[PDB]
Design a protein around this ligand. Structure first.
Ligand code: BCL
Ligand code: BCL
Ligand code: BCL
Ligand code: BCL
Ligand SMILES: CC[C@H]1c2cc3[nH]c4c(c3C)C(=O)[C@H](C(=O)OC)c4c3nc(cc4[nH]c(cc(n2)[C@@H]1C)c(C(C)=O)c4C)[C@@H](C)[C@@H]3CCC(=O)OC/C=C(\C)CCC[C@H](C)CCC[C@H](C)CCCC(C)C
Ligand SMILES: CC[C@H]1c2cc3[nH]c4c(c3C)C(=O)[C@H](C(=O)OC)c4c3nc(cc4[nH]c(cc(n2)[C@@H]1C)c(C(C)=O)c4C)[C@@H](C)[C@@H]3CCC(=O)OC/C=C(\C)CCC[C@H](C)CCC[C@H](C)CCCC(C)C
Ligand SMILES: COC1=C(OC)C(=O)C(C/C=C(\C)CC/C=C(\C)CC/C=C(\C)CC/C=C(\C)CC/C=C(\C)CC/C=C(\C)CC/C=C(\C)CC/C=C(\C)CC/C=C(\C)CCC=C(C)C)=C(C)C1=O
Ligand SMILES: COC1=C(OC)C(=O)C(C/C=C(\C)CC/C=C(\C)CC/C=C(\C)CC/C=C(\C)CC/C=C(\C)CC/C=C(\C)CC/C=C(\C)CC/C=C(\C)CC/C=C(\C)CCC=C(C)C)=C(C)C1=O
Ligand SMILES: COC(C)(C)C(=O)C/C=C(\C)CC/C=C(\C)CC/C=C(\C)CCCC/C(C)=C/CCC(C)CC/C=C(\C)CCC=C(C)C
Ligand SMILES: CCCCCCCCCCCC[N+](C)(C)[O-]
Ligand SMILES: CCCCCCCCCCCC[N+](C)(C)[O-]
Ligand SMILES: CCCCCCCCCCCC[N+](C)(C)[O-]
Ligand SMILES: CCCCCCCCCCCC[N+](C)(C)[O-]
Ligand SMILES: CCCCCCCCCC
Ligand SMILES: [Fe+3]
Lengths: 281, 240, 302
C-alpha cells in the first residue's frame, strides 16, 4: 500500500475543511473533505449520465450523448430529458473539477510543496467553463455549449468552427495553436535532453546539467537552463489554454462573422489600402 | 486494408509502450510496503523491470535500480489508528525529527559536483568573478520571520556555479553562526528579506553545515526539509 | 505572498561559461554572445557560444536560401513595392507545380520550379540539421534521444512534402509556402479526404497534442512546486533520490493513485510528444494513397 519512502510524509494536517475528519487514505489515494466532495459530484454526475443513457435507450459508450437545452430554452432550466440533465451534469462536473483542485491544495499543504499544480489545473477548468458556462451565458443560450458524447462533441467542434468559415483565421486561435505546437516541441526536447544525459553512450558515466547547457548552446547558441525549461513548459501549456479560452470567448460575441474577413483591417490600412498590385490590389 | 492493419498494430504498440513506461517508473519506491515496513501482499499487476545501472561521474560509483529500498534513518512517527490508511503522528518535535512536511532523505553526504568535478554550489565570496547581476542585492538585509521579528542578517548568496543561479541565502544569527535559507523560500524586499515559513525563534534550529564553504546533498535535504516544514509546524507562531 | 519561482528575484553572473569539452572540436565554437538580463529573469542570461562547423554552415546556408527563395517570390508577387509587400505578406504563396507536371522537374520557374528549388534547399537544411543534432550529442558522449525525437517531427514534414506527393504521383499534392495558403491547404486536405475527424490517427494525434500540454503543465508545475527542495536538478535526483523527488511522486500517488520517478517522467514526456507527429505522419500518409475518404472508411472500419 505504501511506496518504500512514503510513511514519513503521511502525517496529520493540511486539510482545508473538517479538521481530522476526512484526513486519511484509501490505498494510495488521499481523501480529505474534497475527496469526499469529488466522490459525491462525480458519482451523481455519472449516475445522471447513466439515467440519460436509459432515457435515450442505449448502453453503448459510443452512442451515449447528453445534449444541452435547445436554443429555444435560452438560459432558463429545461425538462430533464430535453437538456435538464445536461444542466445538472454540468453542475456536477464543475463541482468535481473544483473539488479535485481543492483536494490537490490539501495534498500540497500536507507535503509542504508549492501550489503550482492545482493553479495549473485551474486553467483547464476555466477553458471547460468558457465552453459550457461563460460563452453560452454571453451568447444567451445553454444550447451553444457542447454535448457530452464521445463522437457528438466532435460534431459540435466541427459545426461550431465552420459557422465562422475556416476557423484557422481566428487570430487568438493561431496564437493558441502556436503555444500548443511549441509546447509539444519543448516537451520532446526536455524529455530527450534529460534522458540523453542520464543515458549516455554505452559504458560512459552519466552526464551533468553542464553537458545539457553545453549541448543546447552548441546546437542553437542558447540554453534556457534546468529551472527555465520547467517554467517554460508551464508557461507554454497554460498560454495555449489561456488563448484557447480567449479564442472562443470572443467567437459569437464580439466577432461573429467569417473569421477570414477580420484580416481586412490590416489590408485596408489607408497608407497602403489602394496601391495596385499584390494579392489585394 | 492497410489502414485497419496500421491502427490495429498501433493499439498493440501503445499497450506495450504503456507497459514499458509504467514498469520503468517502478525503478524507485517498490516493492510496496505495509505501514510497518514489510512487503505488501498486493504489488499491482506490473512486475519490477530488470535492473539498470547508472555510472556516476567522479569515482562516485554506480546506482542500480530497482534495488533494495531502505530509509537509512530513524522515523519518529507512530500509528494513530488500529487499521491501515490513517495518519502517523510525530512522536516528538516534527521539525527536529524531520518528518511530515519537514522530512529529508538520506542522500549522500557529499556535495553535488559540476561537470569538472568541482563543488556545484559555493558561497558567492569564494566564487571568482561571481556577483549580483540584476535585482535587489539581498546581502546586508535584515531577515524577518513570519512572527515579524528579525532573525538575522544576510551575509552571502550561495550560487550554483555551472548554472549561474542563486540557490541559498546565508543568514547570520544573533550568536554569530550562520544558516542557509533556500532562495525559493524567501522574499527579497527593498529593506528586508522576508521568510514566511519560519518564525524568528525557529532559525537556530535550521540544520547546520559541517564545513562553512560547501554543502552536502544530505545537508541541503535537511535544510530544505526543515524550512518547508515550518509552513505546517511554525504556523501557530506565524502571524499574517 | 509566498514567492512562486516563476521569475527570479536576484540574478547572479559569473565568468562566461565555455562548456564541457569532451570530444568537441573547440575550434568550431564561437565566443560567447552578450548576456541578457531580460532573459535572465526567466532562464539563463548567457548567449552562446554556438558550435558551427561545416555541417552547421551548410544547414544555415540552405535554410537561408530556402527563406530567400520564398522571399524573392513574395517580392515578385508584390511587384517589388515594399508597401504591397507588408500589406499582402500573409497572402503571398510559393505554390508547387500543377498536377500535369507529375513528379517531373520540368515546370517553369514561376509555375512550380521555384517551389522545387526552395524545397530542395529546405530538404538539405533540415536533414543536415538532423545530422548536427546527432553529432553534437555524439561529441559529448550523450544518448541520441534528441535526434530520435527530432526524427519524429521530420517524419510528419517528410510525409507532407515528399513521401506522400511521391506516392500520389505529383508535386502538386505538397504544401505551399505561405502563411494563409498553408492554412487553406490544411482545411482543404480535410475536406477532400471526407473529414479528418474520421482519421483515427488524426484523432490520436490530437489526444497526444492535448496530452503534451497536460503533461508539461503537470511536470513543469510539479518541479516548480518542489524547486524549494532542489527538484529541478533532475540528474542528481535520478542518481540519488531526494525529498524533492519523493514529494513530487507522492503528490501524484495521493491524487491519482500512481506516480512516476524523476527519470521515468522524462520517458512519459518524450513519448507523449513524439507520438503527436508519429501518429499524425501515419494518418497523413494513408490519406489518398490508401484511404480516399475517412468517413467512408470508418463506416466499413476498412
Ligand atoms: C499541422 C498541419 C499543417 C499546419 C497547420 C497550422 C495551423 C492550423 C496553424 C499553423 C501555424 C503555424 N505554422 Mg503551420 N502547419 C503545417 C506545417 C508547418 C511547417 C512545416 C515545415 O511543416 C511550418 C514551418 C509551419 C509554420 C507555422 C508557423 C507560421 C505558425 C506557428 C508554428 C509554430 O508555433 O511552430 C513551432 C514553434 C517554434 C517557436 C519554432 C519555430 C519558429 C518559427 C515561428 C516557425 C515559423 C517560421 C515561418 C516559416 C517564418 C514566417 C515568415 C514571416 C512571414 C516573415 N507550419 C501543416 C501543413 N500551422 C499557426 C499560425 O499562426 O498560422 C498563421 C496556426 O494557427
Ligand atoms: C473544423 C474545426 C475547426 C476548429 C474549431 C475549433 C473549435 C470550435 C474549438 C477549437 C479549439 C481549439 N482548437 Mg481549433 N479548429 C480547427 C483546426 C485546429 C487545428 C489544426 C491543426 O487544424 C489545431 C491544432 C487546433 C487547435 C485548437 C486548440 C487551440 C483549442 C483546443 C484545445 C483546448 O481548448 O483545450 C482546452 C482544454 C479543455 C477544454 C479540457 C478541459 C478538461 C477538464 C477540466 C477536466 C476533464 C476531466 C475528465 C472528465 C476526467 C474523467 C475521466 C478520467 C479519470 C480521465 N484547431 C478547424 C478549422 N477549434 C477549442 C477551444 O479553443 O476551446 C476553448 C474549441 O472550442
Ligand atoms: C478541447 C476542445 C474541444 C474538444 C475537442 C476534441 C477533439 C478535436 C478531439 C478530442 C478528443 C477527446 N476528447 Mg474532447 N474536446 C473538448 C472537451 C472535452 C472534455 C471536457 C470535459 O471539456 C473532455 C473530458 C474531453 C474528452 C476527450 C476524449 C474523449 C478524447 C481524448 C482526449 C485526450 O486525450 O486529452 C488529453 C488528456 C489525456 C491524455 C488524459 C486522458 C483523458 C481521458 C481519455 C478522458 C476520458 C473522458 C471520458 C471518456 C468522458 C468522461 C467519462 C466520465 C467518467 C463519464 N473533451 C472541447 C469541446 N476532443 C479526441 C478524440 O479521439 O475524440 C473522439 C479528438 O480528436
Ligand atoms: C480544417 C482542418 C481539419 C484538420 C486538418 C489537419 C491536417 C491536414 C493535418 C492536421 C494535423 C494535426 N492536427 Mg488537425 N484538423 C482539424 C482539427 C483539429 C483540431 C481541433 C480542436 O479541431 C486539433 C486540436 C487538431 C490538431 C492536430 C495536431 C495533433 C496535428 C499536427 C501535429 C503537429 O505538431 O504539427 C506541427 C509539426 C510539424 C508540421 C512538423 C515540423 C517539422 C519540421 C522539421 C520543422 C521545419 C522548421 C523549418 C525549417 C523552419 C525553421 C524556422 C526557424 C528555425 C525559426 N486538428 C480539422 C478537422 N490537421 C497534421 C497531422 O498530423 O494530421 C494527422 C496534418 O497534416
Ligand atoms: C491547462 C493545461 C492543460 C491541463 C492541465 C492539467 N490537467 C489536469 C491537471 C493539470 C495541471 C491536474 O492536476 C489534473 C490531474 O489530476 O491530472 C492527472 C488534471 C486532469 N486533466 C484531466 C483531463 C483532461 N485535461 C485536458 C486538458 C488540459 N489539462 C490542458 C491541455 C483534457 C483535454 C485536452 O481534452 C482532458 C480530457 C483529468 C485526467 C485530470 C482531472 C481529473 C478530475 O477532475 O477528476 C475528478 C472528476 C472525475 C473523476 C469525473 C467527473 C465526471 C463528471 C461529473 C461527468 C462527466 C462530465 C464531462 C463534462 C463529460 C465529457 C464527455 C466527453 C466525451 C466530451
Ligand atoms: C515531435 C513533435 C514536435 C517537434 C519536435 C522537435 N523539433 C525539433 C526537434 C525536436 C525533438 C529538434 O531537435 C530540432 C531543434 O533543433 O530544436 C531546437 C527541432 C526543430 N523544430 C523546428 C521547427 C518546428 N517544429 C515544429 C513542430 C514540432 N517539433 C512538433 C510539435 C514546428 C511546427 C509545429 O510547425 C516548427 C516550425 C526548428 C526550430 C528546429 C529544426 C531546425 C531546422 O531544421 O533548421 C534548418 C536550419 C534553418 C532553417 C536555418 C533557417 C533560417 C530561417 C529560415 C530564417 C529566419 C526566419 C525568421 C522567422 C526571421 C528572422 C531571421 C532573420 C535574421 C533572417
Ligand atoms: C534539462 O533541462 C533543459 C535545459 O536546461 C539545461 C535547456 O536549456 C533546454 C533547451 C531549451 C531552450 C533553449 C528553449 C527553446 C525555446 C522554445 C522551445 C520556444 C520558446 C519560444 C517562445 C517563448 C515564443 C513562442 C511564441 C508563441 C508560441 C506565440 C506566437 C505565435 C504566433 C502565432 C505569432 C503571431 C500570430 C499572428 C496573429 C500572426 C502570424 C505569426 C507568424 C509566426 C508570422 C531543454 C530542452 C531542457 O530540457
Ligand atoms: C518529476 O515528478 C513527477 C512525478 O513523480 C516523480 C509524477 O508522478 C508525475 C505524474 C505523471 C505521471 C505519473 C505520468 C503519467 C500521467 C499522464 C499521462 C497524465 C494522464 C493521467 C491519467 C489518464 C490518469 C488519470 C487518473 C485519475 C484522474 C484518477 C482516477 C480516479 C480514481 C479511479 C479514484 C478517484 C479518487 C477520488 C474520487 C478521491 C477520493 C478517494 C476516494 C473517496 C475513494 C509528474 C508530472 C512529475 O513531474
Ligand atoms: C525581407 O525580405 C527578404 C527577401 C530579405 C526575405 O528574406 C523575406 C522572405 C520571406 C517573407 C519569407 C517567408 C517565408 C514563409 C512565409 C514561409 C512559410 C512556410 C510554411 C508555412 C511551410 C509549411 C509547410 C512546409 C512543408 C510541409 C515542406 C515540406 C518540404 C519537404 C519535405 C522537402 C521536399 C523536397 C523536395 C520536393 C525537393 C526534392 C528534390 C530532390 C532532388 C531531393
Ligand atoms: C560566429 C557567428 C555565428 C553566427 C550564427 C548565428 C546563430 C543562429 C543559429 C540558430 C539557428 C537555430 N534554428 C536553426 C534552431 O534556428
Ligand atoms: C494514459 C495512460 C495513463 C496510465 C495509466 C496506467 C495506470 C498504472 C497503475 C499502476 C499501479 C501501480 N501501483 C499503483 C500498483 O503502484
Ligand atoms: C504515452 C501516453 C499514453 C496516453 C494515451 C491517450 C489515448 C487516448 C485515446 C484516443 C482515442 C482515439 N480513437 C482513435 C480511439 O478515437
Ligand atoms: C484513461 C483513464 C485511466 C485511469 C487509470 C486509473 C489509475 C489509478 C490506479 C490506482 C492504483 C490502484 N490500486 C488500488 C491498485 O492501487
Ligand atoms: C489509453 C489506453 C490504451 C491501451 C490500448 C489497449 C488496446 C490493446 C489491444
Ligand atoms: Fe523535467
Amino acid at each position: 500500500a505504501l511506496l518504500s519512502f512514503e510513511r514519513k510524509y503521511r502525517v496529520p494536517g493540511g486539510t482545508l475543511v473538517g479538521g481530522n475528519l476526512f484526513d486519511f487514505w484509501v490505498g494510495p489515494f488521499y481523501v480529505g473533505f474534497f475527496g469526499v466532495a469529488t466522490f459525491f459530484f462525480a458519482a451523481l454526475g455519472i449516475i445522471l449520465i447513466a439515467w440519460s443513457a436509459v432515457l435515450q435507450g442505449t448502453w453503448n459508450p459510443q452512442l451515449i450523448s447528453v445534449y444541452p437545452p435547445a436554443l429555444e430554452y435560452g438560459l432558463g432550466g429545461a425538462p430533464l430529458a430535453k437538456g435538464g440533465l445536461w444542466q445538472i451534469i454540468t453542475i456536477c462536473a464543475t463541482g468535481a473539477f473544483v473539488s479535485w483542485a481543492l483536494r490537490e491544495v490539501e495534498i500540497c499543504r500536507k507535503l509542504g510543496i508549492g501550489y503550482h499544480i492545482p493553479f495549473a489545473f485551474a486553467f483547464a477548468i476555466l477553458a471547460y467553463l468558457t465552453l459550457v458556462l461563460f460563452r453560452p451565458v454571453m451568447m444567451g443560450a445553454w444550447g451553444y455549449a457542447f454535448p457530452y458524447g464521445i463522437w457528438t462533441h466532435l460534431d459540435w467542434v466541427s459545426n461550431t468552427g465552420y459557422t465562422y468559415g475556416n476557423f484557422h483565421y481566428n487570430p487568438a486561435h493561431m496564437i493558441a495553436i502556436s503555444f500548443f505546437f511549441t509546447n509539444a516541441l519543448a516537451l520532446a526536447l526536455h524529455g530527450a535532453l534529460v534522458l540523453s544525459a542520464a543515458n549516455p553512450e554505452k559504458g560512459k558515466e552519466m552526464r551533468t546539467p553542464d553537458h545539457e547547457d553545453t549541448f543546447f548552446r552548441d546546437l542553437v547558441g542558447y540554453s534556457i537552463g534546468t529551472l527555465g525549461i520547467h517554467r517554460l513548459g508551464l508557461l507554454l501549456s497554460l498560454s495555449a489554454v489561456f488563448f484557447s479560452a480567449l479564442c472562443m470567448i470572443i467567437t459569437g460575441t464580439i466577432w461573429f462573422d467569417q473569421w477570414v474577413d477580420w484580416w481586412q483591417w490590416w489590408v485596408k490600412l489607408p497608407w497602403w489600402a489602394n496601391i495596385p498590385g499584390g494579392i489585394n490590389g | 486494408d492497410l489502414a485497419s492493419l496500421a491502427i490495429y498494430s498501433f493499439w498493440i504498440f501503445l499497450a506495450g509502450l504503456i507497459y514499458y513506461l509504467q514498469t520503468e517508473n517502478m525503478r524507485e519506491g517498490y516493492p510496496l510496503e505495509n505501514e510497518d515496513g514489510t512487503p505488501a501482499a498486493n504489488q499491482g499487476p506490473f512486475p519490477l523491470p530488470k535492473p539498470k545501472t547508472f555510472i556516476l561521474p567522479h569515482g562516485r560509483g554506480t546506482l542500480t535500480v530497482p534495488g533494495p529500498e531502505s530509509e537509512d534513518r530513524p522515523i519518529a512517527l507512530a500509528r494513530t489508528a488500529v487499521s491501515e490508511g490513517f495518519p502517523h503522528a510525530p512522536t516528538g518535535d516534527p521539525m527536529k525529527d524531520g518528518v511530515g512536511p519537514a522530512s529529508w532523505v538520506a542522500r549522500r553526504d557529499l556535495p553535488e559536483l559540476d561537470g569538472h568535478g568541482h563543488n556545484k554550489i559555493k558561497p558567492m565570496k569564494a566564487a571568482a568573478g561571481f556577483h549580483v547581476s540584476a535585482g535587489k542585492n539581498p546581502i546586508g538585509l535584515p531577515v524577518r520571520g513570519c512572527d515579524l521579528e528579525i532573525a538575522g542578517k544576510v551575509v552571502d548568496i550561495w550560487v550554483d556555479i555551472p548554472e549561474q543561479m542563486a540557490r541559498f541565502l546565508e543568514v547570520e544569527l544573533k550568536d554569530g553562526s550562520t544558516r542557509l535559507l533556500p532562495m525559493q523560500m524567501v522574499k527579497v524586499q527593498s529593506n528586508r528579506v522576508h521568510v514566511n515559513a519560519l518564525s524568528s525563534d525557529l532559525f537556530a534550529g535550521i540544520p547546520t553545515i559541517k564545513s562553512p564553504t560547501e554543502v552536502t546533498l544530505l545537508e541541503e535535504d535537511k535544510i530544505c526539509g526543515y524550512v518547508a516544514g515550518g509552513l505546517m509546524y511554525a504556523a501557530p507562531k506565524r502571524k499574517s | 505572498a509566498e514567492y512562486q519561482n516563476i521569475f527570479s528575484q536576484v540574478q547572479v553572473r559569473g565568468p562566461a561559461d565555455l562548456g564541457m569539452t569532451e570530444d568537441v572540436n573547440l575550434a568550431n565554437r564561437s565566443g560567447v554572445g552578450p548576456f541578457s538580463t531580460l532573459l535572465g529573469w526567466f532562464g539563463n542570461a548567457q548567449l552562446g557560444p554556438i558550435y558551427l562547423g561545416s555541417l552547421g554552415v551548410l544547414s544555415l546556408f540552405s535554410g537561408l536560401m530556402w527563406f530567400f527563395t520564398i522571399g524573392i517570390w513574395f517580392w515578385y508577387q508584390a511587384g517589388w513595392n515594399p508597401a504591397v509587400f507588408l500589406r499582402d505578406l500573409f497572402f503571398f504563396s510559393l505554390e508547387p507545380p500543377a498536377p500535369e507536371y507529375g513528379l517531373s522537374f520540368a515546370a517553369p520557374l514561376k509555375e512550380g520550379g521555384l517551389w522545387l528549388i526552395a524545397s530542395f534547399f529546405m530538404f538539405v537544411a533540415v536533414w543536415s540539421w538532423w545530422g548536427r543534432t546527432y553529432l553534437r550529442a555524439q561529441a559529448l558522449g550523450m544518448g541520441k534521444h534528441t535526434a530520435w525525437a527530432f526524427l519524429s517531427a521530420i517524419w510528419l514534414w517528410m510525409v507532407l512534402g515528399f513521401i506522400r506527393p511521391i506516392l500520389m504521383g505529383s508535386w502538386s499534392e505538397a504544401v505551399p509556402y505561405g502563411i494563409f495558403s498553408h492554412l487553406d491547404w490544411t482545411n482543404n486536405f480535410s475536406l477532400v479526404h471526407g473529414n479528418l475527424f474520421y482519421n483515427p490517427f488524426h484523432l490520436l494525434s490530437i489526444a497526444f497534442l492535448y496530452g503534451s500540454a497536460l503533461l508539461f503543465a503537470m511536470h513543469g508545475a510539479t518541479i516548480l512546486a518542489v524547486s524549494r527542495f532542489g527538484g529541478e536538478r533532475e540528474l542528481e535526483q535520478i542518481a540519488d533520490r531526494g525529498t524533492a523527488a519523493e514529494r513530487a511522486a507522492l503528490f501524484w500517488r495521493w491524487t491519482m493513485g500512481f506516480n512516476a520517478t524523476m527519470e521515468g517522467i522524462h520517458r512519459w514526456a518524450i513519448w507523449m510528444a513524439v507520438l503527436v507527429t508519429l501518429t499524425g505522419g501515419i494518418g497523413i500518409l494513408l490519406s489518398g494513397t490508401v484511404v480516399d475518404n475517412w468517413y467512408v472508411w470508418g463506416q466499413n472500419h476498412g
